[PDB]
Structures are given as C-alpha cells and as structure tokens.
Symmetry: D2
Subunit: 268 residues, 4 copies
C-alpha cells in the first residue's frame, strides 16, 4: 500500500517527507523535486536530498525519504513530484492544475481544457489560467482587495487514467470518495466536485470507478494571493491518491512489471 | 476500537445484514426504532413492510458493548439507514447531538436560503413534505418541475445539519483524519453524489468545521447528486443523513470514549469543564 | 479489499453471527459444510444440534464476491470455526491448500515426534481419536493423565500444518506483515494461548516460512495453551486451525488476487510459470 | 495512534526513522539515541540528528524524524529509545532485556529476575546475563562453534505497566497478540511466549490484558554472536508496542496530561 508521512516545523532545520511501497525503477532526481517546489512559490532557493530508497537515479523498492532545507506545503509538493514521476513512467498518467475562479470572477467554461502540454503557459500565468481574458479581470480584482484572503475554485485534471480504478462498493474506498477526502483535507478547502458536480459530465469517475475519461476534480477554497499555490498543492494530493489506487489495482515490484500488468488487464 | 461498520445483502436474497462494532454499552435501541427509520427512506414525490431483528449485541433494550448485528427482512440503502438509526440513538443519548436532513434544490429549482434553517423539531413536517423541505413555495415548484420531466433521473442538492456537536472533534493536521475530510468522503461514497460542501463552500459560514475541527456551531454538509415513479433526491438526503451520523459517531467516540453511554457522557461533561 | 472478518453474538442470545468480506466470487460453500465443521469443535475426551443460515453473499451454492454473513443458531468458538470452514473451501478450491490440526502434547504427556506428520487424508482418524492424535501409544497415556486430574484445566500444545502453500506469500520487510508474524498473532489472540512457534523454534525445520515468507514446504505452526467433563485442548486445535486458515486465506488473496476462484487460480498458475 | 516508519540502505548516506503521535513534553536528546545505538554493538561512532518534532530537548507533538549516519537494526533501536523515554516519563514503565539461553545452554531459572537497575551489569556482560555461571558456560560454547549461527532464547521484561492495557476481545488486537507479532517480525525469530508459555506464571498478560504484574516476553531465535544484539532489538519493538497500547488507553496531548489520565483511571 502506498503510504506517506511528512514532518518538520515551520521554523526548524529541515522538513522530511517519506513515502513507502513505490516500486523499483522509477527515475526520480533531487532536481525534479527542487523544480516541483519552485512551482509552489508562483502566484500574483530550495535544497533537497534523497536520503534513502534511490541509487543511480532510480527507486529501489524500499522507503524513499526526502530532506528539504528551510504550516508548510513543501513536503507534500515534494511527495507529489515523486508520485508524478511514477504515474507517468508506469502508466502514462499525467495531471494538470489551474484556477477556474478567483474572488468571484469565473473563467470561460467554453474554452479548451488545459492539458499536460500547457504546463509552461500555466506556470507563466500569474494566476494559473490559459483564459487570458479572465486572467486580467482576476488581476484587477486582486488589486482592488489583503491578497491572501480572497477565495477561489481550482481544478485538477488527470489524463491517461485507465478505466477500472476504484470500487463499485458504496464506501469511502471509492475513487471519487478518496479524491474528495484528499482535497478537503487541505487547509482552506470547503468543497469538492467530480466533473460539473453541483452544476449537474461525470468527470471521469462513475459508480466509484474511473471510466477511462479525463478525471476532473474541483476544489472550492476560502481562507500574494494563495489560490494558485492551492491548485498546485491539490495536484500533489490528487497525484498521491491516484498513485495509491493505481498501484493497488496493477501494482508490481518494479515499474516494468507494473506496465506489464497494465497491458495484461488492458488486453482483456 | 474505532466505531466500525459493515453491510451485506443482495437485493433479492432472504435478508440484508448490518453490523457495527465499537459502540459503548448502554445505548437505548429497539427494532421498533429501526423499522421506523427504515420507513422514512421510502418517502418521496411520485406521479405513477420492514421486519427487523437485533441478532446480537443488545440485551434488555440496551447495547452491551459487543458487536451489534441487525437482520432486515426481504442497490439497497436499508442497511445503512438502519445503521444510522443506531448512530442517531447513540449521538443523542451520549452527546445530545441530533441531525436533520432536507432537500435544498431539486431539478434546478432552488429553495429560499433566507428561510430559517430546519431544526430537529421540524422532523414530522419534513417527513410530511413530498419533497422534504419547509419551503411550501419551493415544494410546489419542485413538484411542478418533477411533473414536466422519468422522475428518478432528476438530481439535486441535499443538506444535512448537525446540532450540538461540541468543539474539538477532528484534527488540525492536514490529512484524511479531518472531520470535514471524513464527511466529504462519507457523502461522496454514496452512489450518484458528485459534490460535497461544508457550509456554503463553493459560494462562500464555516459550516461548523474550521481548521479540520468542529467549532461548536451547527455543522452543515451539502451534497450534490445526479443520477410509485418518484424522485430519488429526498431519499438520498435520508441516506446522506445516515452516513453523516455514522461519521459523527465515530469521531465523537474517538475523542470522548467510554465503555458506556454514562461514562462517555461524563467525559464530555469533563472536557467542557476544561 | 483485504480479506476481513468479524464475529458477534452472546453465549445466550438468539444467534451468533459471523461475517467475512473480500472473498472472490465462485467459492463452493453450503450450510452443510459449516454444520459439519461446527460439529468437530465439540470432540474431546471426557470423564463425566447446530443450525446454520447463509444470510448473504451466496447464491446457487457459490459466493458472489460480496460480504458473506452467517447465522449460527443458539465465550464461543462457533463463529470462528464457521469462518474457518469458509476459508477452508476457499483455500482448497483456489490454491489446493489444506490444513490439519492435531494435539502434540497435553498435560505434560508428549506425543512421539519421529512418527510421520499427519496429512489431510488423516482427518477422519484424527476426528475419531478422543485426544486428536495418531499416536495410539500417546493417546492412552494422555487419557490416563486426564483421568488422574478438573479436565478442562489441563493445558497442552497443538499443531496446525498447512500443505500446498506456494512460495512467496508474506514479505522480506521485518514487520507485522510477515506471514510468521501474522500467524503468531492469529494464535496468540485465542484465549488461553501463551506460546507460538513456527517449525520447532524453541528447540530448533524453518516450519515453511523463512525471512518472512512461505518457501513452499509444509507450514507448521505450534501453540501452547494453558487455561461431558472433557479436556479443552483438542477443541483449541480446531479453533487454532480456523484462525490459521483465515490468515493464510488473507495473505494468499493479497498475493494472487482475483475476483473469482477461476481468476485467482489462473494468477497462481501464472506466478508459478515465473 | 503511535505509528513509525524506518528507511535506509545497508550502504547509503543515511538511515531515517520517523515516529508520529507522540505527545508534547517528552525529554529526548540525540545523546540518548547515540547511547541506545552503542548498546546494539555489544556482544561476545554513531552520529544522530533530530530533524523534526523537538525543540529545547522536548517533543512538540508533531512527527519526530531521526537521521543516523552510516539489514540494519539501528533505526529500530533509535525508535525504541524514544519509546523508552516516553514510557518512563509518562508512566514509570521501564524495560529490561537479557539472554536466558544460547547455543543450548540454559541460564538458571531459580535466580532473581533482572530489573532496570541491573542495566549496567547487563551491558557489561558479554552475553547479557547476570547468571555468572551460565555466562562462562555460554562463552565456552561460543568458542567451540561460526559464532553468528548459534541460536538462543531472549527475554524482555516490562515493569510498571498498569493493569488494563489491551482488550478482552479474542483477536490480534490483544496485548499478548501484538507483542507476539512484534517479536516474530524480527529476522531469525521462530517463537514467542508470554511467561512460562510452552513450559506451562501468566507473564503479566491475562485474557488479552495487562494485569499489573511484570510482563515477561520470550523470543526464540535461530538464524561475533548475534543473540545479545537480538535481545536489544526485541526490547526496542516491545517498547514501541507498549508505547502504542499505553498511549491508546491513556493518551493525552502532552506527557503531563497523559500522567494525569493515568492517575484518574488508577484512582477508580
Ligand atoms: Cl506532466
Ligand atoms: Cl470564487
Ligand atoms: Cl439541482
Ligand atoms: Cl451507561
Ligand atoms: Cl503440556
Ligand atoms: Cl470462478
Ligand atoms: Cl531504563
Ligand atoms: Cl538455545
């Protein structure tokens, strides 16, 4: 079972993150993590060590512990980076995060959904959106406001998820249940939807199981603005939950065995 | 032992079975209580009896502290509603916690938010309403809206409110163990639910949970669902109530413990004296 | 979902109830199988009927994949023995794993270790023996020993053997998740048990588990217990067998999975082809 | 719930141990841990950092992570040291570990049981026993043997445990069940007993619950000798299980609240 723990005080010598149950063969580097941490600072000099579980840039199958030199989101974002690598390398699964509403201003829903290829443009946007018209209105609104007190709605999309991850049983063990819980557990979040949700299309989860479509998770939040950073942190938690459920369903001891189990299932 | 439960049964086998472990000795519970809560899951506006046995864990009308197994005669929601009736009796007797469920929107037709929140004393009236709301005005539009539609295909929004929850249940740690996270999970795990809010979230007020923990105010949980010939939404609210109760029972039991309703009651009384 | 089980019932209430979740569809199981396994828990040398319902999870004699609830008519060991009968049928049908239980010592009187180990084909003979051993010589001394004693106060050592377990079940990681650790826990959690060995441990042979994992040999688990007018030891062996089976079912299900006995069987067949 | 994880490769830059759910107020230092690690080397230059969860020599209530600079038992022994501090400071509970048989030679059971005050004498004994007659026979036997292949039986005693920790319910959640599992999960162990066990007085656990007596746990093992080190490692795991169960039964958020909950229960 993929399991993780974080540690470290706002003003201490280090933050520690530890993840267990990841298979051997995942390519992960400290520069990957430094890069993932920089992204958390974005919105209108991190040092990382991989202490255990890695040799020659690959996971070994043992527990991976990360030391980050410095409330904090760093350690969760670091874990999300490891989860990101694993999901892509083992399954072709990739996520995207963006802000779809901030301070009451909505983005245009008729516009194309962002994709993983839009990552550079989203990092470049001060409020993490491709909707250039909404962005300038959001910026105006931020400037009329203190900044970190404004609310918003964020969205995380997951591509390449194969159908069949989750359970048909009605319980918190369903995939939409686990995701809803992962988001709402983030400070400031007050709501979560799968797809159109309250507006109701399914958002890629139907009857507790992924259906093969894009998974669209939205989180409402209400506590220099904090909304873009929240989208990034939420992406980390969505990645971790997705990694956990995908590994439970197709898990092998090495990334190569894991793909091999995906191709088997997918060929029947 | 954490409060833990399980259900079983096929929609056309002889019986449905529900089991719950971790409940303290001394909860006052009867088959009658359950037959009653089961009746309510059938209410709902349309346009076109239950037998219960307490197989284990109860003696002389009171829980023993051991696992309680319930046989309900015969997807099903009965075993969960039954379970919520047991949680209801525990919450009220040990903590004076009571919940209420109502439909705040159905098929696009919203109710009026200004109207005062329903309270537990409004139960009989809520059961009497075909669409489970106190908004007479809205009830007629919703009925109109159902009539112009197949009924059970319409979705809506439900609300569950919890009165009397003391402050300090849940945790500051940002994780799954937060009370708001567990409730989101409890709702979202019910078939057809696509959304969940604490307070007026997507529009916002904390809804009684701040920083992962109950603050003493009324707790408000909303859920959006979208699936004779009746609508499914009022019943969804009754099921959501069942799961909110179970979660609240679990978390309250964890904080105030006790091997008996009396001891649990004393631990709360003690905690509130600081 | 991990194989998971729960029992309930009071020693003088209407029924005992046992429930097990996570079992694959297609296990062949009948009330009859259970009445039978329940009869065996009563065997034991002395000096001075069961009704079973499969309330859920079974249709046309086969498991459905959903939770299985069992009502046994009426401390008790019946619900665990019932549960072990279900695990027995699963183990044998999905993996060809079968177990045997026997008493290797009682009241200080040891059996002879040189004699060949009992096999599953020795069941009928083991049931026929008042002290559940194939050591005719020892059986008479034990009976002698019981006679010179209150019978149920005498302790002893029991052994459970598991044939056909494939290699690779459990883990290398030094923790609770090792197969030998889980079995130690399964036994030690039974009332009166004070000791547990894998193989000939205290005297030593691996007993089929090395480095936290099954190696393909026969698995051997020993347990030391010390509490008409019969001895309790032969029945303890039957209960220990029930818990060893459940643990083995859990761990095997975790490694070979499958939503059906057929699919699980194919995953093992696949694993053994490397 | 007291929860711990360990990480680190036999030949890597560090070993990491992390423990969560410990209350604020436990006095613990890196010198305590260095000392506990030295004890593991004993039998016929460790550097430790407390990365998180501690300030002014006291736990804060958050997760405690430990870095140890170097199969390994170091990280478990480190966790046992933290567990030791907590158990003594919160409950007056203290443990002892010793070898009661090695290579077939038995110690004298008529002799006084060791106590926590016997710690210096036990560390000083090359085979961890107060039975001086048995010790020289054990040493002879070791010398007649390769050394690390000899088996033995170890014992861990726990003093000051209050009656009532565990459960009467027949399951692996009983205290004797949890302890049996903690020992047997250690490599090389093949058997565990509570009290006289197979010999059968109760060894301090009756009907799944501690009874107020001394808890006596024995572990049979069969893989320069390794038996004394195994006794120390087993003590670490017994400490952790005891800490976990005691905290579940009387746990408060600070050591002071925890004692206070013990005195309450104990006064009724
Ligand atoms: Cl990407
Ligand atoms: Cl907004
Ligand atoms: Cl609606
Ligand atoms: Cl009471
Ligand atoms: Cl004996
Ligand atoms: Cl099948
Ligand atoms: Cl000490
Ligand atoms: Cl020995």
């Amino acid at each position: 079972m993929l399991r993780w723990q974080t540690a470290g005080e706002s003003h201490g010598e280090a933050l520690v993150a530890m993840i267990e149950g990841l298979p051997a063969g995942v390519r992960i580097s400290t520069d990957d993590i430094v890069s993932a941490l920089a992204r958390r600072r974005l919105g209108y000099q991190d040092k990382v060590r991989l202490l255990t579980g890695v040799r020659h840039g690959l996971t070994l199958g043992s527990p991976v512990a990360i030391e980050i030199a410095n409330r904090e989101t760093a350690s969760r974002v670091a874990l999300g980076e490891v989860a990101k690598q694993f999901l892509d390398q083992a399954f072709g699964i990739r996520t995207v995060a963006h802000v779809v509403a901030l301070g009451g201003v909505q983005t245009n829903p008729d516009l194309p959904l962002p994709t993983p290829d839009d990552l550079e443009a989203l990092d470049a946007s001060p409020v993490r959106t491709l909707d250039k018209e909404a962005e300038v209105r959001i910026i105006e609104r931020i400037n009329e406001a203190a900044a970190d007190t404004l609310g918003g709605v964020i969205e995380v999309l997951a591509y390449g998820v194969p159908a069949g991850i989750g359970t048909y049983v009605e319980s918190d063990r369903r995939l939409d249940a686990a995701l809803a819980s992962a988001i709402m557990g983030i400070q400031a979040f007050k709501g979560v939807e799968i797809g159109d949700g309250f507006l109701a299309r399914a958002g890629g989860i139907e009857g507790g199981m992924s259906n093969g479509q894009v998974i669209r998770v939205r989180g409402a939040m209400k506590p220099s603005t904090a909304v873009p950073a929240a989208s990034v942190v939420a992406e980390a938690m969505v990645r971790l939950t997705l990694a956990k459920y995908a590994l439970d369903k197709f898990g092998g001891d090495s990334v190569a065995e894991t793909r091999r189990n995906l191709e088997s299932y997918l060929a029947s």
